[PDB]
Structure formats: structure tokens, C-alpha cells
Amino acid sequence: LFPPQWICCDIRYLDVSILGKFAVVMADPPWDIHELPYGTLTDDEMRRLNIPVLQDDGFLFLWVTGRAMELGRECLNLWGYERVDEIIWVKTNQLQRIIHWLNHGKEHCLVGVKGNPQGFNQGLDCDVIVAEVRSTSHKPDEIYGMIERLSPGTRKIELFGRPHNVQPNWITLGNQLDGIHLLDPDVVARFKQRYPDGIISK
Numbered sequence: 719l720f721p722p723q724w725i726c727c728d729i730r731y732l733d734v735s736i737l738g739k740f741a742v743v744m745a746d747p748p749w750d751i752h753e754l755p756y757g758t759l760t761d762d763e764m765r766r767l768n769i770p771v772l773q774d775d776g777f778l779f780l781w782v783t784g785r786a787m788e789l790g791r792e793c794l795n796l797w798g799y800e801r802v803d804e805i806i807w808v809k810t811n812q813l814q815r816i817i818h819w820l821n822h823g824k825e826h827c828l829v830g831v832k833g834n835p836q837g838f839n840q841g842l843d844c845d846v847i848v849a850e851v852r853s854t855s856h857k858p859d860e861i862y863g864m865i866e867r868l869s870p871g872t873r874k875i876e877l878f879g880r881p882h883n884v885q886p887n888w889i890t891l892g893n894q895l896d897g898i899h900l901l902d903p904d905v906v907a908r909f910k911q912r913y914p915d916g917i918i919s920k
């Protein structure tokens with residue numbers, strides 16, 4: 719249901735079974751790679767998220783860094799995906815120049831597959847993004863274009879997004895979103911039923 723939708727919530731506690739199935743899931747988690755930042759999930763919390771109910775056939779896009787390069791592979795496998803690709807984003811300035819043992823010129827995004835997705839435009843884009851580091855901790859807007867060309871029109875879901883990530887054809891989840899904005903009638907129905915007083919607790 720085309721326009722941007724979102725739910726401000728604690729992704730640990732949302733009953734995501736109300737949301738339906740998605741052709742693409744994207745996640746950019748607050749990994750515990752530093753227990754400092756306000757919203758960090760522990761490794762068990764990451765592992766224990768109910769990603770498996772969100773899709774039957776389609777793709778998962780999982781931003782990873784540091785030791786989450788390993789842990790995200792683990793979660794991806796535990797959640798029932800095979801990792802079939804890996805996108806890297808080469809971070810440049812506005813003049814197209816690049817930005818422990820080595821300085822880091824790129825972010826990594828894992829691509830996992832579940833089931834047998836049919837009718838996707840595999841092979842349209844290459845596994846390398848080149849884009850300007852806009853704000854810190856922002857992901858490049860180009861990922862949505864690649865995902866839309868890969869699976870045009872389909873329903874998509876982002877976990878741990880921020881208000882700037884809300885997109886048409888996407889439902890965005892995070893705890894710094896402005897309230898709850900839903901328009902897909904099926905989703906609105908199930909949300910009112912699961913959450914008749916609009917609170918998302920426990």
C-alpha cells in the first residue's frame with residue numbers, strides 16, 4: 719500500500735506477525751560492537767528477533783560492521799537465510815574521493831535469500847555502491863533504488879530505521895520514529911486487534 723508507513727516501537731517487543739509477508743527485509747541493527755549506544759541489542763536479542771515470520775520467499779539486506787560481519791552471518795543463518803551476495807558501499811566526499819589495522823573505506827551489507835524468490839530482476843545492479851557520506855550513521859539512499867529495481871512494487875520492511883528512511887512501498891520500524899503511521903488496511907486491522915489501546919509493551 720504505496721505511501722510510507724511506520725511504527726515507533728521497541729523492535730524487541732513488537733508482535734511482527736501483524737505486519738504480513740515481505741518481498742524484501744532490510745535491517746541496519748545497533749549491534750553490540752562497542753554495550754554503549756542507547757539502543758544496542760545484545761547478541762541474544764539480535765538472534766532472538768522474529769525475522770523468520772516476515773517472509774516466505776525473498777531477500778534480506780543486513781548491514782554489518784566489525785565483528786557483526788561474523789555475527790550477522792550467524793543471525794542470517796539462524797533466521798533461515800543463505801547469504802548469496804554482499805554489497806559494499808564505497809564512501810566518498812562530494813568530489814568522488816575515498817574517505818584497527820587498516821583505515822576503512824567502505825560499509826558492508828549482507829544479502830541473504832529465503833525460499834525461492836521468483837520474478838526478481840537479479841543482475842540489474844552490481845555489488846558496489848559509490849555515494850557521498852551524507853550524514854554520519856546514514857545509509858546511502860541508493861540502496862532503495864537497487865532494491866526497487868530488484869523487486870519493483872512489492873512490500874518491503876526496514877528494521878531500526880530512522881525518520882529519514884521512510885520510503886514508499888516500505889514500512890519502517892524504529893524507536894525514534896514519530897508515532898505510528900499505517901495505511902495498508904490489512905495491517906491497520908491486525909494492529910488495532912493486537913493493540914486495541916495502541917500501546918506496544920512487554
Ligand SMILES: CC1(C)CCN(Cc2ccc(C(=O)NC[C@]3(O)CCCN(c4cc(NCc5ccccc5)ncn4)C3)c(O)c2)CC1
Nearest residue numbers: 727728729746747748756757781855856857878892893894
Ligand atoms: C553506516 C551504516 C550503513 C552501517 C551501520 N549503521 C549503524 C547504525 C547507526 C545508527 C542507527 C540508528 O540510529 N537506528 C535508529 C534507532 O532508533 C537508534 C536506537 C536503537 N534503535 C531501535 C532499538 C530498538 N530496541 C532495542 C532497545 C535497547 C535498549 C533501549 C531501547 C531499545 N527498537 C527499535 N529501534 C534504532 C542504526 O540503526 C545503525 C549505520 C549506517
